[PDB]
Structure 1
Amino acid sequence: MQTLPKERRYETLSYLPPLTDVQIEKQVQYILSQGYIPAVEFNEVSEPTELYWTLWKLPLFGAKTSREVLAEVQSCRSQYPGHYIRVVGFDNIKQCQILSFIVHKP
């Protein structure tokens, strides 16, 4: 018998325990093997009232393996230690966004 403490618990996939390197790439493999476009985004602060996250280098239109989508975030580990890095997944056609998960936190 207990309450919930006061954390930020950022957007989505954030009340579950923080997703490890297997669960990062399995969701990245869900992006490409379902035909979505794995884009990487970063931002200074991760509240969901700052509405735009700044897009890392490209949204990776021709990304086919998780070993290179994560390897673009490997180029984004050392670049931004203090930014909430995030791999989003855009729909290829129908104008929507699906996956959203922070891969790196300050």
Structure 2
Amino acid sequence: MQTLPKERRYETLSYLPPLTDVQIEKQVQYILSQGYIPAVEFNEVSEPTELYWTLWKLPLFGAKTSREVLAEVQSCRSQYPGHYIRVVGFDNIKQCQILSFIVHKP
């Protein structure tokens, strides 16, 4: 009969335990393996009002691997440590958007 703790959790794929770097490879790899080309975003506060988070760079497109995405997220979070970073999936063939998941929370 355990109660539910008061936790302001996050939008999608966030009730899980925090994502190990092996799993962050695999999530963006399936974002790669649909013939799709991923992207990175960040913000400070995760509001229901705030629908937009700030882009990191241009969306990554080309013939690259999952480790070339984590160079922006994992290896280059040093200038925004106390911010909410996520991976965005901008499914342009169907004008859709796939697999927001928040990464490296303070």
Query: TM-score, normalization: structure 1?
Result: 0.90
| Alignment CA distance shift 1:74-1:14 (3 Å) | closer
CA contact (8 A) 1:90 1:99 kept: no
Aligned-residue offset at 1:75 = 4.8
Uncovered stretches (5+) of structure 1, i.e. residues with no partner: none
Aligned-residue offset at 1:64 = 2.1
Larger displacement relative to structure 2 (74-83 or 18-27): 74-83
CA RMSD of aligned residues (A): 1.4
Deviation string 1:41-72 (CA, Å, 9 cap, x unpaired) is 00011233211000011111225200100112
Q: Which has the higher strand share?
A: 1
Could you tell me which residue of structure 2 aligns to residue 94 of structure 1?
A: 94
| Alignment CA distance shift 1:83-1:90 (3 Å) | same
CA–CA distance in structure 1, aligned partners of residues 104 and 96 of structure 2: 24
CA–CA distance in structure 1, aligned partners of residues 12 and 43 of structure 2: 16
Aligned-residue offset at 1:86 = 0.8
| Alignment CA distance shift 1:38-1:45 (3 Å) | same
CA contact (8 A) 2:44 2:83 kept: yes
CA contact (8 A) 2:12 2:99 kept: no
CA–CA distance in structure 2, aligned partners of residues 105 and 13 of structure 1: 14
Report percent identity of matched pairs.
100
Alignment of 1:1-106 (within 5 A): 1-62=1-62, 64-106=64-106
Aligned-residue offset at 1:100 = 0.8
| Alignment CA distance shift 1:63-1:46 (3 Å) | farther
CA contact (8 A) 2:31 2:37 kept: yes
